[PDB]
Each structure stands twice: as C-alpha cells, then as structure tokens.
Amino acid sequence: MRVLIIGAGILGASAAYHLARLGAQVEIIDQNHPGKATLAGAGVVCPWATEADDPDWYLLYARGARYYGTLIEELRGQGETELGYSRVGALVLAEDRARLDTIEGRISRRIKDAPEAGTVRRLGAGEAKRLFPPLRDDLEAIHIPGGARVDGRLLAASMLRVAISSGATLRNDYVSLRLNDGRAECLGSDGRPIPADEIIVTAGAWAAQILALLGLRHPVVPQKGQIIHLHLPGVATSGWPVVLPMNSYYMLAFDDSRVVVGATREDGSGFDYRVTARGQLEVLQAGLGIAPGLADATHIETRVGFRPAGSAMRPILGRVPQIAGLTIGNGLGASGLTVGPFAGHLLAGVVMGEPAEVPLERYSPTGPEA
Amino acid sequence: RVLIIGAGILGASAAYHLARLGAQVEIIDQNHPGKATLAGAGVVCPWATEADDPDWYLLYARGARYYGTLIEELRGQGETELGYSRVGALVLAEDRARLDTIEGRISRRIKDAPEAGTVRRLGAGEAKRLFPPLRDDLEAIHIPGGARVDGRLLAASMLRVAISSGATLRNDYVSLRLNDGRAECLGSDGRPIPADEIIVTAGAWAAQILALLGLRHPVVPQKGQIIHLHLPGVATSGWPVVLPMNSYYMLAFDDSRVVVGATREDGSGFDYRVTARGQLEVLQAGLGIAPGLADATHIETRVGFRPAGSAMRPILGRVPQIAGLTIGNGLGASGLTVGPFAGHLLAGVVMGEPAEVPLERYSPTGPEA
Amino acid sequence: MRVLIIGAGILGASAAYHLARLGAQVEIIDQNHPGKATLAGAGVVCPWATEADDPDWYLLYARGARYYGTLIEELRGQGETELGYSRVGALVLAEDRARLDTIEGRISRRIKDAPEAGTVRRLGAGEAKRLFPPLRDDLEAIHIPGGARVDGRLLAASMLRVAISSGATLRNDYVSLRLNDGRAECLGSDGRPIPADEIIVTAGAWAAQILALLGLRHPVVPQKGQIIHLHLPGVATSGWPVVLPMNSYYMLAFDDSRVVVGATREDGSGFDYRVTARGQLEVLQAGLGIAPGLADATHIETRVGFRPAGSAMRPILGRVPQIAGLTIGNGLGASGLTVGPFAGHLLAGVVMGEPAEVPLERYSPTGPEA
Amino acid sequence: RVLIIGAGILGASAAYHLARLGAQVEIIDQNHPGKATLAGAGVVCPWATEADDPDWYLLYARGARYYGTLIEELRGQGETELGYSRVGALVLAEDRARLDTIEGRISRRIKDAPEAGTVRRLGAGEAKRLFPPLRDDLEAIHIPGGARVDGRLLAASMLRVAISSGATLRNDYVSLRLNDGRAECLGSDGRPIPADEIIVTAGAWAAQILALLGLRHPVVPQKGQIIHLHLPGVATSGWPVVLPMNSYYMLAFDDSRVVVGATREDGSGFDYRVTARGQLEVLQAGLGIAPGLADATHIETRVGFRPAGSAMRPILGRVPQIAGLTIGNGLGASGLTVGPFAGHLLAGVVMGEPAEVPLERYSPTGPEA
Ligand SMILES: Cc1cc2nc3c(=O)[nH]c(=O)nc-3n(C[C@H](O)[C@H](O)[C@H](O)COP(=O)(O)OP(=O)(O)OC[C@H]3O[C@@H](n4cnc5c(N)ncnc54)[C@H](O)[C@@H]3O)c2cc1C
Ligand SMILES: Cc1cc2nc3c(=O)[nH]c(=O)nc-3n(C[C@H](O)[C@H](O)[C@H](O)COP(=O)(O)OP(=O)(O)OC[C@H]3O[C@@H](n4cnc5c(N)ncnc54)[C@H](O)[C@@H]3O)c2cc1C
Ligand SMILES: Cc1cc2nc3c(=O)[nH]c(=O)nc-3n(C[C@H](O)[C@H](O)[C@H](O)COP(=O)(O)OP(=O)(O)OC[C@H]3O[C@@H](n4cnc5c(N)ncnc54)[C@H](O)[C@@H]3O)c2cc1C
Ligand SMILES: Cc1cc2nc3c(=O)[nH]c(=O)nc-3n(C[C@H](O)[C@H](O)[C@H](O)COP(=O)(O)OP(=O)(O)OC[C@H]3O[C@@H](n4cnc5c(N)ncnc54)[C@H](O)[C@@H]3O)c2cc1C
C-alpha cells in the first residue's frame, strides 16, 4: 500500500524502479495514450552541448547524464540487456565557424564536472563524414566521445521489468483524482478509491487534466513532435555517433541499419495524433540538408509523440504544497530521456523522505489557487 | 447556452438536436482511448433481446424506430454515408427447444412493432441462403426489418450537422464544481467555461468528474473486443444480421466487410488492449456458426468500453438538487440503438419541452453524504 | 563478376556472408517480396525432439544447430551483438504420458551423441510452469537445456551487414534467368544480362518461377504460415525456455516481454499474403490450450510467411547438372533458420570449388528436362 | 483462343474488348511488386501536355476522348465505381510568359476535340477558389474537360466485365518459348498453356520474358513514388486536377483525399522502396504550390514502375517473324489516359480488324539473328 504511480513513461518507470529497490510496494497504472512521448523519444544522450545555460545544468542535465553509466550496468546485471544504449560519441555542427567556436567553449567549460564526455576535439571538414558517412564533406564539427544514444521505449520497459520482478505490479487503466480532507485520493475505473500511502503523478502531457480536479493549475501542455525512422539496407550503423546541428533538429543511428532524424516542435498543437505533410517535410529538409547520403534510404515509419512541455524549459519536480500524499513529476520537455532516469531517483527520495540530493525548490509545483 | 461534455453517439445527438433549435452549443470531447461509439458494432434489432426490463426496452424499441426519422432528416441535409441499411436479421439457436421459446419472445414483443415485418421460421439451409458463410444445418427465424449502421459514421455525421448550425467542438478534459448550487465547468487550464445549461454524456468516464459533486454515478466501463473481417471480392450489401443468442453476433457492410460479435469483460477498467483470449472467443463463436468465414482476411480488431450501469436501464434527466446540470449515460451494449433517440430526450430536458416519454424512472440521484 | 546472388533471405544472406569474407566479389539482389519467409520465421533452434526421421535432412538439421555457436561469436566480434539469440533451453510437452515416454526415447538416443543439448532431464508436473509461468501446472515435460532461439530477421540482416562491410553490394531489384549457349545468364531490370562468373539462386519459394525459364523442374512451392506475436507488459522473459508441444505448434519468448506462438502450415496456399481468421484461431487455441497465462496478453501483430516447402523434406543444394555457372539453394521448409546459416557455408564452398564438408550428392538439384 | 500475359490497365483493357468479340480469353498475372497500374494517379488531360510529338500525341488525344464511350459502356454494365469524374483541370506556370505559350498550345488542339469545353484564363487567385489549398497569387488556365480516375479500380472493373463474359484470371509467373515458329506459353509447373494467340502486356517486366525469344524490348522500369493525403472533414469531390507543368501534379478524390505528383527515377530498376528524397521532392513540389496541404494527414505512399520505353511512343503490334505473338508496352507515364484505347487496338490486331491508327510507327522488332 506504499506507493501508487499514475503514468509509466520514462519518468514514472524510473520512479518505480528506484522505489522497488527501497522495499516499498509499488502499484503502477498506465493508460498508454496514443502519442505517449516516451514511445517516440529519439534517444539522444548528450547534455554538454545543450544551449539552455541555466543552473539546471548543474542540477539535472549534468547529474542525470553522469548516472547513465551506473544505471545501464545495474540493469545489465539484472537480466535486462536490450536497452538500445551505446556510448557511440556525438558530433556537434554549426553553420558558420564563428558560432561553432562559442559552442566549443560552452562545451569546454562544462567538461570539468562531467569527465564521461571524454576528450572533446575539433574536427575539420570531411572528418565528421568519416564517422557518419551520410554527412556532407564540407562540415566541420566538434566530437564528444561521451555522447550516447538509447531506445527510450526499451529503457523504460526494462526499468519496469526490474521493478515488477521484485514485487511491483502494473496494469492498463485510466484513473482520476479527488481532494479528500486536504489529501489526494486516486479513483479507479469503477470510482472507488485506490488505497495508497503516497501518490506520484507522472502522467506526462495529460497530467494537467487530472490534477485540475484538485484545484491545481499545472502549466504543462503537449508539444507535438513528428520523428522519422529510416533504414539503410545492409549498412553497418552500430558504430555511428549522434549528430547535433544545433538548429532544433538532430539525427542518430541504431544497430539494425536504422537512422532516426530530428523531430518537429509544434506548439499549441494539442493531442493531435496525425502524421502531417509539412511536419515530415521539415524533418526531411533538415536531415538531407546536412546528410545527403540518406537520400535513397528507406522510410520505414514516422512516430508521433506529445512532449510534456512546461511553461518554463525546466521541469516540475517535488511534493505539492498544501496537499498531503501527492508528488508530481513532469515538464521534461525535450530532454526527458536524459533527465528522466535521474529525475525518477529524486522522486524516489521525495516520497520516502530521503535527504534531497539537490534543491527541488527551483522545480517545486504550485499549490491550489482557491 | 449549452455545454456538452463528451461527444460520443449520445453527446453528438444532443448537439445535433439542440443546434437545429438555435441554442448556442459548445461541445468538448477528450476522445479517451476506447471511445465506445468508435468500437460499436452497429446492430439494431431489439425484438429478439432476452433481457426483459420494460423501462429499458421502452427506449430500446423506441430508439430503433427513430432511425426512420433520423436517416431521412440526415439524408435531406447532405449526409448519405451512414452505413445504415434495413437488411433484415437472422436469429439462431443450437437446439430446437430454445429456438421455440425464442420464437415466442419475438412474437410477444412484435405486438406493438410492425416495423419488425413478417417473421418466419426458416428451414435448414434457408438461413445459409441469405448469409452464405453460415453452415447449412442451422434453422433460424427471419426478422425482415432488423438493420445495421456504422456508429462511427453516424456520430460523425450528426456532429457535422451540429457544427454547420453554429455549434463548436474542441478537444479537452473538463471538470465540474459546485459554485452556487449550479454546475460550473472548468477546463484543463482551470478557467471557467460559461454555460447556461451543462450536459454530461461522458460515457464510462462520467463517474470520474461527477464524483466531485458528491454524486454516486453507478456507471463503470465494460471492455469489449470486436473483430472486422474482409471477404475479397464478395458482395455483402444484402447480407442480414445474425444473432446466435449466445452473447455473440455478426453483421456485414457494403465494402465486402464482416463484423463479428464482441466480448463482455466485466471489471476490465479502461484496459485499452487487444488481448489473446478475447480474440479467441470471438473467432470460435463466429467460425462456429459461420465456417465460411474461415479464409477471410482479418483487417483490424477494435476495443471499446461500454457505459455499463448498475441496472440495465439508462440514466437520463436533470440532476436533483443541482441546477443547470443534466446527465445521460448507462447505455451499455445498446447505445447505438438507444443513443440517437436519447439525445432527443436530453435536448427536450435542457430546452424545457414536455417529455415525449416520462423520464422519472431514469432520473439520476442527488448528492449523497 | 565473381558471384551473383538472387534472394537475400537467411540462405542467400549466409552464402553472401561466407563468400565475401573469402575475397569474392559478391553482388546481392533481393526484391523482398511480401511474405519473405525469413521476416516471419519464429526462430526455434532445437532439433533433437523432431518427429521427422530423415537422415539426409537430419544431418544438416543437427549440424546447422551446432554451427550457431561459431556464428554468434563470429558476428559478435564484428559489431553485430543484437541477434536475439539465447541458449535458454527447451521444454518438450505431450498430452498423454505414453507418447511423452516415446518422445523421451527419441531424444535420449539423439542426445547421447550431442553434448550441445546438455543434460536432458524429465520434469514433474508443475516444474515446467516454474520455467514458463503461463503454462498449466499439470504438465509434465522434458527439459533440454541446449534448446535455443533467435530472431531470424536480425540474424540474416547482420550477416548481410558483415558481407557488405566486406566489399559486397545489396540492391532491391527483380531479376530473371535465360539459358544461353549452355551457361546461365541473369537478366537485370533492363533485360540485358548481368556479367557474372557464378550465379546462386536462393529465391526461396519464388525460385521455381525463374528457374523454369531454364527448362528446370524445381519442386519447391510456398507453404503459407501465420505466426502470432504477443506482449506481456512488464514481464521479464529473457530467461524463458522454448516450448515444443509436439503437435505442429510451439511458442517461444524474447527479451522485450514478447512471446511468439506456433505457426500454421497451409498447403496449396499459393502466395496468399493475408491474415486469415481460421489461421489465427488455430494458433490461439494451441497457445492458450497449453498456456492459459497468455490469455490476457496483448496481441501486437500476426506475421505471414511462405516457406520454401519442397517435395522431399531434404533441402536442395549444389550445382545444377548440365548447366554451368549456376548453383541452387532452396527447400529449407520449416527448418531454414536452423539449416540456413550452415547451408550457406556449404553453398559458398560449392561455388568456389572448395571440398564439401558434407557429401552434397544427396541434395543436388535435377538437370534440365529436354 | 487468346492468352494475355499481364493484367494491368493494358492487359485488362485487352481482355475487356476481346470478350465482347466472343474470343475465349485466359488471363495470367503475377502482380509483381510495384505494379504500375496500382500506383497510377489517374489524370486524363492530353491537351495541356508539353510533349509535342505527333507520333505519340496521335494516340494520346485519340485515347483520351475514348473515355466518354468507355465510362458509359461500363456504367451501363453494373460498373459504377471507377473513381472517374470530369472535374476539370487547372494548368499553372512560373511566369506569365510561359503561361501565354501554354494557352496557345492548348487552344490549337481543341479544334476537333470539344470534350475540353470552353478554356478560360484565370488570374489573381481565381484558381484557388476551385482548389482551396493553392496559392492566391497563381494565375491558371482552366480546362473543364480534364478528368481524373482511379487506375486501380478501372482495371478491376474491365476485368470483372471480361470474366462475366467467359474470361478466366489466374496468378502465376509465366514464360515464353519458340515452338516451330509459334509462341508458346509455359507456366510455373512447366506444362504448356494452349493458346491460339498470345498478347504480352507485362509492363516493365516484359523485357525479361521477351529476351527468352531473342527479342530486344527497349522498355525499362522508371520508379515513381506518389503520396496520398487526407483532409479531415473536407469535401473534395468537386475539386479539379492541377498541372503545374513542372513534372509534378496533384488531384483530388471524393473521400477527402488528395494525391500529389510522382517522382521519375531513371535507372532505378525494380526498387520497391519508399525513399527519403523521393518523398521530400513530392512534398516540396506539392506544398510549394499548395500551402493549404501543410496540415493534411499523410495516409499512404505508393510505388510503381512505369513501362518507360526508349522513345516516348509506345510499342503495339504483332512480333515480326514469330507466329501468334502480339506485344503491347511502353505506356510510360501516360498509361492511364492511353491504356484503355490501346487495349482496343491490341484486340483489333489479334482479331484482324483494320487499323484505326497507323501501326507501322509502333510495331516491335523481330529476333536478332
Ligand atoms: C519526437 C520526440 C523526440 C524526443 N527526443 C528526445 C531525445 O533525443 N532526448 C531526450 O532527452 N528527450 C527526447 N524527447 C523527450 C522525451 O521523450 C520526453 O520528454 C519524456 O519521455 C517524457 O516522459 P514522461 O513519462 O514524462 O511522459 P509520457 O511518456 O507521455 O508518460 C505519460 C504516461 O502516463 C499515462 N497517463 C496519463 N494520464 C493518465 C491517467 N489519468 N491515468 C493513467 N495513465 C495516464 C500516459 O498514457 C503515458 O503512458 C523527445 C520527445 C519527442 C516527442
Ligand atoms: C464492442 C462494442 C460493440 C457494441 N455493439 C453495439 C451494437 O451492436 N448495438 C448497439 O446498439 N450498441 C452497441 N454497443 C454500444 C455502443 O457502442 C455504446 O453504448 C455507445 O457508443 C455509448 O455512447 P456514449 O456517447 O455514451 O459513450 P462514448 O462513445 O464512450 O462517448 C463518451 C465520450 O465522452 C468523452 N469524455 C469522457 N469524459 C470526458 C470529460 N471529462 N471531458 C470531456 N470529454 C469526456 C470520451 O472521450 C468519449 O469521447 C457496442 C459497444 C461496444 C464496446
Ligand atoms: C511462420 C514461419 C515460422 C518458421 N519458424 C521457423 C523456426 O522456428 N525455425 C526454423 O528453423 N525455421 C523456421 N521457419 C523457416 C524459415 O523461416 C525459412 O525456411 C527461411 O526463412 C527460408 O529462407 P530463404 O532465404 O530460403 O527464403 P526467403 O527468406 O523467402 O528468401 C527469398 C528471397 O529471395 C527473393 N527473391 C525471390 N525470387 C526473386 C527474384 N526472381 N528476383 C529477386 N529476388 C527474388 C525474395 O523476395 C526473398 O527476399 C519458419 C517459417 C515460417 C513461414
Ligand atoms: C507513380 C505513377 C504514377 C502515374 N500516374 C499516371 C497519371 O497520372 N496518368 C497516366 O496517364 N499515367 C500515369 N502513370 C502511368 C500508368 O500508370 C502506367 O503507364 C500504366 O499503368 C502501365 O500499365 P501496364 O498494364 O502496361 O503495366 P502494369 O500496370 O505494370 O502491368 C503489368 C502486369 O504484368 C504482370 N507481369 C509482368 N511480367 C509477367 C510475367 N512474366 N508473368 C506474369 N505476369 C507478368 C505484372 O505482375 C503486372 O501485373 C503513372 C505511373 C506511376 C508509376
């Protein structure tokens, strides 16, 4: 009766994974809405290049990317060997040499507190193409040996599998909320309450819909994103790194001759689960523009997902003011696969009472407006 | 003016009927996974049902006859593709003993229903002559007048007519609170949604927001999986509905397509998944009476959550002790037949007309303590 | 113009994989017809329990199962580490103890000269359910620790990747054949011949269509097969064994909470690439019959594949009599994922002239029928 | 009597005409991946075509106005679902200059072709009023006679009429053999297929089986990728066809569906794959002139291999020096407009009727020593 988690994406799954290790009874409930963000998550893990230069770097991006090393092994030693993860390195690009210099600097300043990045290095024209053949030969780049990739769906799935293997439960259902005597109550499909000492709301983009039932104003709305998957027949891509043109687009490669190209950021889209023409056109232009070698690659599918985009680019983590037994994790935006796993460790310490490894006040949620 | 929460077959009909009368209708629909109206098979044949509840049957048979008014009212408005057709129905039974008791039930309920046509008990092989895939050793009772419809296309057409008449439709999950004895609607952001009259046709999900008002809404979801088949290059526009009276059924549509009866999974919750045993049961039932479907293409299997109430009879009418709030739900497994006519009844409530049928026996319950 | 391979299934891919490593210039052509057998192969590798006792066929079946040990590491050391292979053991079931005793006899006789099978051990009721939870608790079984499984598509894909990394070429095209001056010619899309010293036809079920152009009578026709893929949300299956109920059906599990169930065997089906109703019913009955735990598992997809089923259960491998520069490999039927990989190694030696590890006279095709 | 190899729009048209003349028809089709007729967009508008070749345009114009006869003969036969509609056509251009030259070329060719109607030059967004997604700043030339059709449904309709008239259809990959000067057809089993006359409408794959007779058939596949869009809740049955005169195009069907011009990939072979650049080219060309399609749903991308010949002129007529063999191929990118009438000619060849059109300029070559 310890913990009840609403939503089992990368964030809700990481919370369960970390809670099950603390001996708590974890009950997970996940509807798996069409457009579940984690099912469409590209899988880039490389914070050192992010242009968002706030103290969130020291707290979430840096700390989160440093934990991937430990997490992958902790999972590997538990029977979970299919995560799609690989420390393949990353290539960062820019249109003009001027902007490419300020980015190299921003990365250099951020290697001190994250040695997993390796030895950052400046590549000349044609050298990035030797690591990612589809790239243009006239592209200079910055190589970050530490940058990795992952299959967002498989990572969350494996974390859930480890939790359920050790006394956790998972079912497919849609639950709601009610405010009882100042405490948070979870109402099942029938309508009866679901006994739980602590509740965690990691409902992603849909969180604002059930939290509003408690008088809360959750400032997280869906940001639609369309992401293209390509197939290179008979092409060994297991060693290819990730590519970050620093223009809201990106692309990476997986072992099964597969290449994924950066997604769109459609604001005010709502929950529009449709593959549109312009959306795919945007991605195809940005992709083939830097990597003409992908021209004759097969188009296998185009996934759609709704990012939990918060008002601020920083997430919303911590216990709810004025409401007992309610914690929420959301707002991961476009960096959820990188921050999600560690953010889940934070929520684990919150509901249990462990000492805060970081100051969550910068991310604490808002209370009832009344 | 009017705010409708939930745009299934029921919420859509209410908007359709109200918009035509000039009321400012604002529709908000979340489109939950498993929206019942999207998964509805579309059989309309109440005279054979084995459930004997007059309060419920009164609307079942009445809503069936209403299709005569609806199809034409929609036809004369640009809407001609609703999948509706008066193709007739075949009622089957395994042992001739049960078939006799059923032939009795049908005649007893046809007393006030000439729309059912002239019933006739068919000899072995006569049912297969109208539905070839059936096995030849099946006696049946033919009800010329039983029809089918594409519930998905019916709700879509009624919404289009409502929007063309000044209604609005947007996607959101809204809630309710008690302000001054009246029902006030809050959007996801939390801002209020001004409305003189609110209607709640949220299907199985209705018991999640009404509970915020102290109401005990006895409607929970009953999952149901339904299989769609395709006979490549086979004319099916004339095939009848088939009701083996064993919780299963099957019907046909124009596009060489055959739909097979659904499951009934109590205590499923909103488990939007296509399970194995669910499809095994449907395929065993279908292929058991219709072995001709063996080599038919399986194109998709849909899932839906029926708004199953504590009692089989629905819940319609204003909420006692709460002003400006009306509820419609509980349709269960007959919402496509009862839905359209019920929306007409919900419209009359918020508009104030005298009830074409006394709604007292369907009214909801007030706030509890 | 060293070698031209027609068809890139598991067999054509294995041949290419072996030839390219020996310096031969390999040109691979594969249309990827709908129903490609390799893309729908279940992936069971456990020959010792087979009811079919054909020495000509069994020689390659048990031989091709042992070759998997070499292949997995060979591919592993080349960057191909995600092949879905695992030595998870197998469970052999039967309804009545009478036939289960007969099966135990066949296995023992064939497990004595096969240490790869491990220590065969007869389990009591409920012990097979301890390894495959969804099974019935009343089932006796025979445990073969050596039984393994693999993802057929990922295996053939990785082989091609290693082959093309070794100077081979892969193209999507439909080619034909004509007989010119007693030697085999391959007609490209334009209709003009394609220069090639040696041709290998691994066209699977479609092989007879183009080989008939040379006066041959290739007795390999398609046998449709429908196979169901299930999903157990939040269930660790990496350690689940294979199940062989010895009733033409079967089922296995993969790492990502996925369970596959035995396939149909539709003779005279032609190239009917449809998912039928009865085909799925039969599989569901067999699966849930012995494994009620799969009842509430998700059904994610149902694949279709045309097995290259030959008149004789033994395959067809070797040069074509009276026709120079032609080599045929086909007839793998329902055991190609086990035989395919090693059978490709045989085809490689044939076309190059190396001595045959196994006398191939018993598998040679027939010559032109004047 | 007659044996047809390949059941695309060309082989189907041939079967539809032969069955009416009382010939015993046996049709065999392998339905290769990328069958051109299954991916054909279906624009019918020869008057605007830029390719001014009289040897090829003789049939293009002649075959286009044959659609009038064909639709009615099919409409008066139970076949009413052809996707055909005389919706008109809009011809656009980059600059007013090129648009002027096109208007002149169009009017010259309608003298003895009144099916085009009254051509009118639009300007300043008048074209957008008939095709909303277009840009407002586009002048155009309206050709009321331009129509569209679903090549997939048309070929099926002809076949059904042919089968209702004693024709047979089978699935197999057949070959050809020289048996004492006669053309003989061998099935997959190797046994011969008795046929008094053989017609080869094998499309791009023809060169492969004809090489078996020592013939050199200069028809190779030209891959083309085509995109289908869906406009949620938008009536498009009345929208005309659009011909930007830039190697691309787009048309609209009844079911809120819009199709965009195809790619032209030479030397592609039978590469049955949907590529990235191919879709980028079509999306750019489509949205470049029709920004309104930005938020349209992408439902499908089809691939087909055009029977592109060395010369744009097709290949029709008996094979020299080989007895009982006839060839039809080379339809290229205009097969849906020329195909139907071309099948009528192939029927006239094998039966012996006089040539309505000069066959000398299309006949194939004989064996090369
Ligand atoms: C196209 C795309 C590409 C991306 N690429 C990257 C990348 O390269 N790197 C990176 O770091 N991040 C990336 N992201 C961001 C990342 O995928 C997300 O930020 C993150 O996965 C969000 O996970 P979540 O669990 O918070 O949300 P979700 O994954 O949406 O989880 C919410 C879950 O809760 C369920 N739920 C909701 N309401 C209820 C309810 N009432 N009852 C029950 N269940 C409920 C939903 O059905 C869902 O399963 C990408 C995102 C997109 C869309
Ligand atoms: C498999 C199956 C087969 C069936 N076959 C038949 C048949 O043959 N004949 C027959 O007569 N009936 C049949 N039915 C029954 C019929 O389909 C349903 O009873 C009917 O569709 C109920 O409609 P509804 O509008 O009440 O519910 P729904 O269709 O579920 O509509 C509810 C809507 O409200 C929305 N909503 C919910 N909560 C909120 C909120 N808080 N805010 C905003 N929107 C919200 C939901 O997203 C949804 O769109 C079948 C049902 C199933 C499942
Ligand atoms: C449902 C199912 C389950 C199975 N389960 C198992 C199992 O558990 N264990 C096991 O050992 N085996 C199993 N098998 C058998 C195995 O999948 C097959 O035997 C094997 O994949 C055959 O490989 P292939 O290369 O001979 O044929 P294919 O994989 O079909 O390869 C033929 C290829 O050649 C191409 N081609 C053909 N003609 C031409 C042409 N003219 N021009 C160009 N390309 C051409 C085709 O497009 C295709 O790509 C199963 C098979 C099925 C159908
Ligand atoms: C993407 C695309 C868009 C197009 N758009 C248009 C348009 O808007 N307007 C227009 O006028 N034209 C258009 N065309 C052109 C038109 O579709 C084609 O020219 C025409 O359909 C060719 O038909 P066909 O019957 O000659 O060949 P196909 O349609 O390719 O038919 C050939 C048939 O023969 C069979 N076959 C071949 N060899 C054998 C064998 N040995 N044994 C048995 N069967 C065999 C094949 O399997 C196939 O079924 C388009 C073409 C493409 C590819």
- CB within 8 Å of C145: residues ≥ 6 apart: C87, C89, C117, C118, C119
Cβ density class B100-139: b for 16+ within 10 Å, e for less: eebbebbeebbeebebbbebeebeeebbbebbebbeeebb
Closest Cα partner for D147 from D182, D114, D116, D111?
D116
What secondary structure does DSSP assign to B130-189, as a single string? Answer: HSTTS-TT--EEEETT-EE--HHHHHHHHHHHHHHTT-EEE----EEEESSSBEEEE-TT
Instruction: Choose one of A6, A14, A27, A30 to mutate for the ligand 1 pocket test, by most ligand atoms within 8 angstroms of C-beta.
Output: A30
d(C-alpha C158, C-alpha B228), whole Å: 37
Task: Compute and round to an integer the Cα radius of gyration of chain B.
Answer: 21
- CB within 8 Å of D29: residues ≥ 6 apart: D5, D6, D7, D8, D11, D169, D170, D171
Would you kindly state where each structural domain of chain D is located, as residue ranges?
1-85+146-218+310-369, 86-145+219-309
B31 is in an annotated binding site: yes
Chain C, window 203-232: residues with a beta carbon less than 8 angstroms from a chain B beta carbon: 228, 230
Binding site membership of A305 for ligand 1 (Cβ less than 6 Å): yes
Contact C325, C294 (CB under 8 A): no
Residue type, position B325, single letter: L
Contact B149, B82 (CB under 8 A): yes
Q: What three-state secondary structure class fits B96? A: helix
d(C-alpha D93, C-alpha D100), whole Å: 9
Residue of chain C minimizing CA distance to A28: C234
How many angstroms separate the Cα of D138 from the Cα of each of A111, B186, D95, D249? 55, 46, 9, 15
Binding site membership of A50 for ligand 1 (Cβ less than 6 Å): no
Instruction: Tell me the Ramachandran region of residue A191: left when phi exceeds 0, alpha when psi lies from -120 to 50, beta otherwise.
Output: left
d(C-alpha A107, C-alpha A49), whole Å: 6
Ligand 3 pocket (Cβ < 6 Å) reads: C 6-12, 29-33, 36-38, 40-44, 152, 174-175, 202-204, 206, 210, 225, 227, 263, 305, 307-308, 330, 332-338, 340
Check CB contact of B276 with chain C, cutoff 8 Å: yes
How many angstroms separate the Cα of B272 from the Cα of each of B280, C185, C294, D322? 17, 55, 17, 64
How many angstroms separate the Cα of A71 from the Cα of each of A17, D284, D324? 11, 43, 74
d(C-alpha D347, C-alpha D349), whole Å: 5
Residues of D whose CB is below 8 A from C34: 33
B29 is in an annotated binding site: yes
Residues of C whose CB is below 8 A from A155: none
- CB within 8 Å of C251: residues ≥ 6 apart: C242, C243, C259, C260, C261, C262, C287, C291
Q: What was the experiment behind these coordinates?
A: X-ray
Element (H, E) at D129: helix D126-130
d(C-alpha C169, C-alpha C149), whole Å: 29
- Would you call B175 and A33 a contact, using CB atoms and an 8 Å cutoff? no
Chains touching C (3+ CB pairs < 8 Å): A, B, D
Contact A143, A101 (CB under 8 A): no
Closest Cα partner for B310 from B201, B222, B209, B211?
B222
Which of A171, A191, A215 is facing B211, going by the closest CB pair? A191
Residues of C whose CB is below 8 A from A233: 160, 170, 172
Check CB contact of B273 with chain C, cutoff 8 Å: yes
Q: Measure in Å the smallest separation between the Cα of B177 and chain A Cα atoms.
A: 9
Q: What are the start-end ranges of the E strands in chain D?
A: 2-5, 25-29, 43-44, 89-92, 120-122, 140-143, 147-148, 168-171, 175-179, 182-186, 197-200, 219-230, 241-243, 250-253, 257-260, 297-309, 315-318, 325-329
Closest Cα partner for B269 from B221, B306, B303?
B221
Both tokens of D262, joined, read 């195809």
Give the other-Cβ count within 10 Å of A274's Cβ.
17
How many angstroms separate the Cα of C26 from the Cα of each of B16, C171, C194, C302, C323? 67, 12, 13, 34, 21
Query: Atom 17, ligand 1: which residue's CA is nearest?
Result: A41
Q: What is the resolution of the experimental data for this entry, in Å?
A: 2.8
Q: Where are the alpha helices (DSSP H) in C165-230?
A: 207-211
